[PDB]
Write a protein that binds this ligand. Sequence first.
Ligand SMILES: [Cl-]
Length: 331
Amino acid sequence: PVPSRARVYTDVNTHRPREYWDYESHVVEWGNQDDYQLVRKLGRGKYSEVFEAINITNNEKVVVKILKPVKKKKIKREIKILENLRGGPNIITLADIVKDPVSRTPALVFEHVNNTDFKQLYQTLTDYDIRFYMYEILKALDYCHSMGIMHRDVKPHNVMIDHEHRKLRLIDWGLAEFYHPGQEYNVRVASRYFKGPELLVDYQMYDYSLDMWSLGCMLASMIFRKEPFFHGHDNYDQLVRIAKVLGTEDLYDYIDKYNIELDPRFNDILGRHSRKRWERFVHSENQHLVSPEALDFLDKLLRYDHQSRLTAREAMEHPYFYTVVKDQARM
Ligand SMILES: [Cl-]
C-alpha cells in the first residue's frame, strides 16, 4: 500500500520541539478540584459525563468533563491537544485540569459553553446561517490543522452553538491526534456516517483531510435536509451508500492509487454505480438551501482521494462563503 503525506501543514509538528506533540512525556500540572463545585449534569457518554459547574473563587460558570476510565496515554493526548489549542478560534477552551476525588479520574475544566449542539438547530437554519456556521467550523479546523492536529470526530453532536450569540465551539477532542507524515493511524475513529472512505477501506496513513470529509457530510445533511446524508447500516454499507452517490469509478481509482486491498467479495457487492449529480437530491423542501456555490463546495469536499479534498483554507476561500464573510455581527 502506497504511503501518503498531507498536502498542507505537513511538517508543522516536525518543526516544533518534541515537547509539543510528545504527549506521553507531558507532565500534567493538576489544578485543585476543591475550587470547583458541580451544579448539574449536562450529559453522559462512552468516555465521560459532562457537568455544569462553578469556580467558587470567582463565581465563574464553567463546564466540567469528567473522563471515564481510559488508558493514561489517551488522557494525556487529549490534555496536551487541548492545551496546545487554547485560544484557537472556535475551539473549546481548557481552563484547568483536576482529579475526580471519587474515581480519581482526570476532569477537564472548560470555559462555559451552551448546552445546545449543532444537531438540535441545523436542520432548521436559513441558507445564510448554514454558510455562517460552516465558516465558523472552518476556522476551528484550519486552526487545529495548522497546529498539527486532526480532530477525527467531526459531527453535529460535537459542535456546540449559542445561536443567540452566534458563537460556536468544536468540542470533544478525545479522538484527536497529532499528524506526523508516515505515521499510521487507527481507522476506528469518527461516527459511521461521517467516516471518510480512507477509514472505511482501512487506509491508515491518513491526515487532516479526514475532517474535511466529515465536514462535507454535515454540509450535505444540512442543505439536503437528510440526516444523516450517507445512512449506512454497517461499515460496508456506508461505503456502498457513498459509492451510490460518488459512483464506483472514482472509488476503484482511489483504491488502486494507494494500493489498498478490497476484500474481493465486497467488490462483488459494490459492483458498479454511476456518479450521480448533486442536483439529484434537491426537493421543494430543501430548494432554498441549495445553490450552485453550495453544490460546487460540496463536490470539492466529498472526494474519495483524501489528497484531492479542499484544505480548510481553500474552503474558506470558496465562493460559497463570498458574502457571509461580510457578516455584520447582529445578535
Ligand atoms: Cl486511537
